[PDB]
DNA sequence: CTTAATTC
DNA sequence: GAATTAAG
DNA sequence: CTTAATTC
DNA sequence: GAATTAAG
């Protein structure tokens, strides 16, 4: 039972993650940047009610906190399908434009897979849940991502902001990838015979045999949980000779 | 008096031209071409009355003649300005597409003028009137350019066609330029010290002195008239140190 | 909603 | 230019 | 008028 | 795609 053996490693049973070994991130602004405060376009009650549960959960989790900031960006009413299903989506484009660029270090899937040797055909694929949220944001950089929030009655003071790396921020993917690489460096050293591919929050572990993959997967899950990351048990593909990774179906050494 | 000295050379007094030394032109068709007969779109009476005088003049001049041809292209109602002023314009595009291409030998004005030496600053500019019409078309090629014509009453039988190189034909400019070059070859040989630039029907004669330009112009006018070409006396610029040629103003060796 | 490149 | 698409 | 590339 | 331009 992979589930009961690693309670801390799975998002379903280990609680929200927090990368304890990573220092809170400081987000450098471009040399000429000054705060921008964009007005929140009026949100319908339907949208507000749909978003409310998520905001409260994030507040309870400490991922969102009240604040007064010179920065402010819009929250928009999203619902891809059309019937119900709401989720808060922040338009951080004006913030992104004022943040210093960093080199794009995440490899494209095609090149990443070129590092998969035919000798290793036993795989385990894991995707980390709420990955960006596991990385803390330094208090100095938190004001940057503020947005407005309120309830027709006893609504929050005014603004709320993120204490963790947020969705919609241009550097989140790269910063997360680099952080996890730092945290998994030792694991790679302790398991020289295993192949570990990282694409932001999507991991592929490859071994030469089922046994090696089993032992390697136990070690990786143990390490991820200890570091504060959380993998999706529901979507995990453990020790299979056929797996779906980054849109590809890895089979018979193909793809 | 340049006018009375060369009666035959000027269009105003020498009658319609005819290049007597040039064999009637045969127009080769592409290897897969077959005749195309395009219907004449109904012409308003206003247009017909405006065009009629020109058709009659051309018929009287023998430039247009009755015919029965498998080829037929449209005549359109033209009048650039808007009030009156009509002229027959034939849409020969479907004929052009079926005629074999020839190398474009007419130089562009820019390069043509590069052959004008600073040593020759006395000029004479002449433009030949109804130049294309001076070149006969071989009877075998005449049917190619047929079009319909008629009068609400005793109108012409049906079709009319050209016995001379027509306007709107893709190769007329090049064929005329080459023909005149053949006819003026001897003149160039007899006058080595003169510079003669030809751009289809626009000629520029350049000499080192007023006297040389005067003598050269007399010889050129005499030669052109004898060959059957006709220059516009109204637009002629004779022995001037400043002239307008091909859109350029030639002055102080400039342009 | 807003900012914007794609198509037509 | 206006409609269609994309994405924060 | 018809055929067509340019712009918007 | 529709209006604007060009040219036989
Ligand atoms: C890939 N892509 C195709 C499109 N749009 C289309 O393909 C497209 C545009 C149209 N437009 C019309 O039909 C216009 N009709 C009309 N004016 N009568 C029809 N289609 C199928 C937009 C984008 C796109 O990426 N847009 C977002 C660019 C960005 N802001 N980064
Ligand atoms: C050089 N040139 C410019 C144009 N047209 C334009 O410049 C032009 C096109 C438009 N179009 C519009 O305004 C369209 N408006 C709209 N659909 N609401 C405005 N202008 C100024 C056409 C040609 C041209 O050469 N056409 C003939 C090509 C040929 N058939 N050989």
The set of strand E positions with any atom below 7 Å of a protein CB reads 1-3
CA of B2 to the centre of ligand 1 (A): 69
DSSP tag of B30: P
Number of domains in chain A: 2
Regarding whether B196 and B86 lie in a shared domain, the answer is no
Same domain, A69 and A179: no
Q: Please tell me the experimental approach by which this structure was elucidated.
A: X-ray
Q: Is position B204 within any domain? A: yes
How distant is C1' of D4 from CA of A91, in Å?
22
Q: Which two tokens stand for residue A208?
A: 């030469």
Q: B92 beta carbon < 7 A from strand F?
A: yes
Tell which residue, A16, A9, A11, A22, has the closest CA to residue A220.
Answer: A9
SS3 B218: helix
Does the residue A255 lie in any domain?
no
Closest ligand to the CA of B93: 2
Residue A220 CA to ligand 1 centre (angstroms): 45
Q: String of b and e for A29-60 (b: at least 16 CB within 10 Å)?
A: eeeeeeeeeeebeebeeebbebbeeebeebee
Q: A210 lies in a domain? A: yes
- According to DSSP, residue B125 is labeled E
Rounded to a whole number of angstroms, the distance between the first and last alpha carbons of chain A is 30
Q: Which nucleotide is nearest to A168 (CA to C1')?
A: D8
**How far does the CA of B93 sit from the C1' of E3, in Å?**
9
> What distance in Å separates the CA atoms of residue B227 and residue B6, rounded to the nearest whole number?
13
CATH of residue A236: 3.30.70.270
Ligand 2 centre to CA of B4 (Å) is: 50
Do A46 and A171 have their domain in common?
A: no
**Do residues B34 and B124 both lie within one domain?**
no
- Measuring from the CA of residue A74 to each C1' atom, give the nucleotide at the shortest distance: C1
Instruction: Please name the residues in contact with B230: beta carbons below 8 A apart, sequence gap of 6 or more.
Output: B9, B10, B11, B14, B15, B16, B17, B128, B129, B130, B134, B224
Examine the domain organization and report whether A109 and A15 are in the same domain: yes
Decide: helix, strand or coil at residue B239. strand
CA atoms within 13 A on the CB side of B102: 18
> Same structural domain for residues B63 and B48?
yes
Contact B160, B59 (CB under 8 A): yes
User: Distance (Å, rounded) from C-alpha B130 to C-alpha B87?
Assistant: 14
- Tell me how far CA of residue A7 lies from CA of A3, A120, A222, B172, in angstroms: 7, 28, 9, 90
Work out if B76's Cβ lies within 7 angstroms of strand F.
yes
Q: Which residues fall within 8 angstroms of residue A210, CB to CB, at 6 or more apart?
A: A122, A239
Is A76's CB less than 7 Å from nucleic acid strand D?
A: yes
Does A108 lie in the same domain as A22?
A: yes
Asked if residue A220 and residue A124 are part of one domain, the reply reads yes
Residues whose CB is less than 8 angstroms from the CB of residue B153 and which lie 6 or more positions away in sequence, other chains included: none
Give the C-alpha separation, B216 to A47, whole Å.
92
Q: Which residue is nearest to nucleotide E3 (CA to C1')?
A: B93
Let me know whether A43 and A80 are in one domain. yes
DSSP secondary structure, A185-223, as one string: HHHHHH-TTSEEEEETTEEEEEESSHHHHHHHHHHHHHH
Number of residues in chain B: 255
Report the distance separating Cα A226 and Cα A18, nearest Å. Answer: 10
Q: Which nucleotide is nearest to B90 (CA to C1')?
A: F8
Query: At residue A236, what are phi and psi to the nearest 5 degrees?
Result: -60, 140
| Euclidean distance between CA atoms B68 and B147, whole angstroms | 10
Confirm or deny that A201 is annotated as ligand binding: yes
Rounded Cα distance, B244 and B237, in Å = 8
- Which positions 57-86 on chain B have a beta carbon less than 7 angstroms from any atom of strand E? 74, 76
CA-to-CA separations, A162 to A142, A170, A240, B91, in angstroms, rounded: 6, 15, 38, 72
Which is nearest to B161 in space by CA: B176, B175, B184, B140?
B140
Q: Which residues pair with A69 in a beta bridge?
A: none
Beta bridge partners of A125: A204, A237
Q: Kindly state the tokens that stand for B153.
A: 């009453």
| Residue with nearest Cα to nucleotide E2 C1' | B91
Distance in angstroms (rounded) separating the CA atoms of residues A102 and A174: 8
Q: CA B55, CA B88: separation in Å to the nearest integer? A: 8
Residue A18 belongs to some domain of the structure: yes
Other beta carbons within 10 Å of B45 = 8
Instruction: Quote the CA–CA distance of B181 and A37 in Å, as a whole number.
Output: 76
Whether B93 sits with its Cβ under 7 A from any strand E atom: the answer reads yes
Tokens 């020969």 sit on residue: B92
* Domain presence at residue B255: no
Q: How far, in Å, from the CA of A98 to the mean position of ligand 1?
A: 28
Do both A7 and A22 map to the same domain? yes
Q: At what angle do helices B210-227 and B172-190 cross, to 10 degrees?
A: 130
Query: Crossing angle of helices A210-227/A172-190, nearest 10°?
Result: 130
CB A63 within 8 A of CB A162: yes
Q: Taking the CB of residue A134, how many other CB atoms lie within 10 A of it?
A: 25
Residue A203 shares a structural domain with residue A150: no
**Structural domain contains residue A72:** yes
Q: B99 CA distance to ligand 1 centroid (A)? A: 43
Structural domain range at position A195: 2-27+102-135+165-250
What is the nearest nucleotide to A76, using C1' and CA? C1
DSSP states of chain A:
-HHHH-TTTBHHHH-S---TTSPPB--PBPTT----BPPPP---HHHHHHHHHHHHHHHHTTSEEEE--S-B--EEEE-SSSSS--EEEE--HHHHTTBPP----SPPHHHHHTT--TT--EEEEEEBTTTGGGSBB-TTTGGGG-EE---TTT--SSEEEESBPPTT-TTHHHHHHHHHHHHHHHHHHH-TTSEEEEETTEEEEEESSHHHHHHHHHHHHHHHHHHT--B-TTT-EEEESSEEETTEEEBTTB-
Task: Report if residue A50 sits inside a domain.
Answer: yes
The answer to whether some atom of strand F lies closer than 7 Å to the beta carbon of B200 is no
Residues 6+ apart with CB under 8 A from A139: A24
Give the resolution in Å.
1.9
A39 and A12 in a common domain: no
Domain containing residue B54: CATH number: 3.10.10.10
* β A122-127/A202-207 pair status: antiparallel
CA angle, residues A230, A235, A236, in degrees to nearest 5: 70
Question: Rounded distance, CA B130 to CA B15, Å?
Answer: 11
Q: Which residues of A67-88 are buried (b: 16+ CB within 10 A; e: fewer)?
A: bebebbbbbebeeeeeeeebeb
Q: Is the CB of A90 under 7 A from strand D?
A: yes
A174 occurs within a structural domain: yes
How far is Cα B195 from Cα B40, in angstroms, rounded to an integer? 47
Q: Is B63 exposed, middle or buried (0-12, 13-18, 19+ CB in 10 A)?
A: buried
CA distance B155 to B152: 6
Task: Output the distance from B182 CA to E2 C1' rounded to whole Å.
Answer: 37
Q: What gap in Å lies between CA A217 and CA A6, rounded to an integer?
A: 11
């Amino acid at each position: 039972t992979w589930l009961s053996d690693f309670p801390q490693a799975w998002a379903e049973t280990g609680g929200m993650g927090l990368a304890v070994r990573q220092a809170p991130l400081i987000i450098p602004l471009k040399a000429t940047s000054t705060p921008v405060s964009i007005k929140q376009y009026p949100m319908s009650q339907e949208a507000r009610l749909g978003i409310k549960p998520h905001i409260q959960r994030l507040l309870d989790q400490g991922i969102l906190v009240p604040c007064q900031s010179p920065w402010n960006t819009p929250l928009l009413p999203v619902k891809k399908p059309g019937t119900n299903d709401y989720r808060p989506v922040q338009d951080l484009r004006e913030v992104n434009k004022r943040v210093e660029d960093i080199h794009p270090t995440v490899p494209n899937p095609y090149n990443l897979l070129s590092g998969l040797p035919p000798s290793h055909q036993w795989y385990t694929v894991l995707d980390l849940k709420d990955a960006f949220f596991c990385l803390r944001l330094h208090p100095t950089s938190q004001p940057l991502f503020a947005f407005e929030w309120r309830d027709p009655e006893m609504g929050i003071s005014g603004q709320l902001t993120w204490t963790r790396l947020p969705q919609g921020f241009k550097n989140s993917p790269t910063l997360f990838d680099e952080a996890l690489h730092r945290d998994l460096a030792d694991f790679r050293i302790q398991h020289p015979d295993l192949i570990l591919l990282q694409y932001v929050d999507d991991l592929l572990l490859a071994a030469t045999s089922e046994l090696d993959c089993q032992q390697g997967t136990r070690a990786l899950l143990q390490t991820l949980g200890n570091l504060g990351y959380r993998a999706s048990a529901k979507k995990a593909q453990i020790c299979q000779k056929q797996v779906k990774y980054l849109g590809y179906l890895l089979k018979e050494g193909q793809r």
